[PDB]
C-alpha cells in the first residue's frame, strides 16, 4: 500500500482524535464563561464534526478564547485531512493515467 | 448502593471556615464533574460551583458572593468545599451531585446540615 | 443567565387525577431542561431529562413535554407518593440554574 493511501488513512484517524479530544477540551474551556453553550459532550461533539468540516450554525461556537483555539486546531485538523484525501486520490488518478498511456 | 457520601451535618462559628466532604463510588470517570447545591430551610435549590476532579478546575456561580473553594482528591476519589466566614445566611443544607458532562446531576449525596451559631 | 420560571408556586390537585407543572425560561433553550422530585427532608431526585426522556427507575406516571421557552411536567393519577417538590433545571447556557419551584398538594 502506498505512502500517500497511508496519511490519508493516518489523517482519517487523526481527525476523529482532534475530534474527541477537542470536544472534551472544548468544554472545560467552556464552563466557566456566562453564555457558553459549549458546554455539555455530546453538543460540543457534533460542534466538532460541524467546525471541522468548516460548517457554522448560528453562534454554536466557543466564546472563551482556549474554546477558540481549539475550534483552530479542530478547522485546520479537518481541512488538512480532507486535502490530504484529495490529494491522495489525486496520486491514484494520476498514477492511473500513466499506465492507461502506458508511459 | 449509595453513589455520593457527605457528613450528615457541621458546625461552625460566625467568622470561621469549613471544608465538607463527598466522596464517591460506582461508575467515575475522567469527564465527570461534581457540583454543589446550597438549600436554605423552605428555599429551593442553589447552584454554588463545579469541579472536574480529573483536572482540579472549578468554576463558581458569580450571582452570589464566593464563601466557597472547590477541591478534590483524585486517589480517593473525594470532592471538598472550603466555605469561610460563615454567618448565618450561610446556614442550609449543601448537597453535591454527579454531572457526566451531559447536564444533569444523576445523583445526588443525603447533603450536609451546616449551621453557623456560636 | 437563563431565567427559569415556575407557576404556580403551589398545585392542589385530587387524588387519581393528572397534573401538570410548567416551568419556563428567559429564552429558547431546545429541550436543555431536566426535572427533579424532592420530597420532604430527601435530597433531589432526577426524574426526567432532556424534557422528555424517562430515567429507569421511575413510574410510568411521569412525562414530560417542551421545547424552547415552555416545558411540562406530567403525572397521571396522582398518589400521595407525589407529594413534594418539583424542580426544573436548565443545562443549555453556563451557569446551570433551577426554578423556584413547586409543591404539590393533594386533596383526600
Known amino acids: 500500500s502506498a505512502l500517500h493511501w497511508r496519511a490519508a488513512g493516518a489523517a482519517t484517524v487523526l481527525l476523529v482524535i482532534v475530534l474527541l479530544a477537542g470536544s472534551y477540551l472544548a468544554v472545560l474551556a467552556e464552563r466557566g464563561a456566562p453564555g457558553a453553550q459549549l458546554i455539555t459532550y455530546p453538543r460540543a461533539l457534533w460542534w466538532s464534526v460541524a467546525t471541522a468540516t468548516t460548517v457554522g450554525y448560528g453562534d454554536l461556537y466557543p466564546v472563551t478564547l482556549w474554546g477558540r483555539c481549539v475550534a483552530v486546531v479542530v478547522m485546520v485538523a479537518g481541512i488538512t485531512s480532507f486535502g490530504l484525501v484529495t490529494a491522495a486520490l489525486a496520486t491514484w488518478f494520476v498514477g492511473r493515467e500513466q499506465e492507461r498511456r502506458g508511459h | 448502593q449509595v453513589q455520593l457520601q457527605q457528613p450528615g451535618a457541621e458546625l461552625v462559628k460566625p467568622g470561621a471556615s469549613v471544608k465538607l466532604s463527598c466522596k464517591a463510588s460506582?461508575?467515575?470517570?475522567?469527564?465527570?464533574?461534581i457540583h454543589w447545591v446550597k438549600q436554605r430551610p423552605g428555599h429551593g435549590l442553589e447552584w454554588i460551583g463545579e469541579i472536574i476532579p480529573s483536572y482540579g478546575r472549578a468554576n463558581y456561580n458569580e450571582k452570589i458572593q464566593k464563601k466557597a473553594t472547590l477541591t478534590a482528591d483524585k486517589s480517593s476519589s473525594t470532592a471538598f468545599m472550603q466555605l469561610s466566614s460563615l454567618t448565618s445566611e450561610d446556614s442550609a443544607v449543601y448537597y453535591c451531585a454527579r454531572e457526566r458532562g451531559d447536564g444533569y446531576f444523576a445523583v445526588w449525596g443525603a447533603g450536609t446540615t451546616v449551621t453557623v451559631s456560636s | 443567565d437563563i431565567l427559569l420560571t415556575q407557576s404556580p408556586a403551589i398545585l392542589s390537585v385530587s387524588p387519581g387525577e393528572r397534573v401538570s407543572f410548567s416551568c419556563r425560561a428567559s429564552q429558547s433553550i431546545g429541550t436543555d431542561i431536566h426535572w427533579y422530585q424532592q420530597r420532604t427532608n430527601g435530597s433531589p431526585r432526577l426524574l426526567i431529562k432532556?424534557?422528555?426522556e424517562s430515567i429507569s427507575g421511575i413510574p410510568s406516571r411521569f412525562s414530560g413535554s417542551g421545547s424552547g421557552t415552555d416545558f411540562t411536567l406530567s403525572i397521571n393519577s396522582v398518589e400521595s407518593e407525589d407529594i413534594a417538590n418539583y424542580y426544573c433545571?436548565?443545562?443549555?447556557?453556563?451557569?446551570?440554574?433551577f426554578g423556584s419551584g413547586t409543591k404539590l398538594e393533594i386533596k383526600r
Open positions: 433545571q436548565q443545562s443549555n447556557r453556563w451557569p446551570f440554574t
Open positions: 432532556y424534557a422528555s
Open positions: 460506582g461508575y467515575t470517570f475522567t469527564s465527570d464533574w
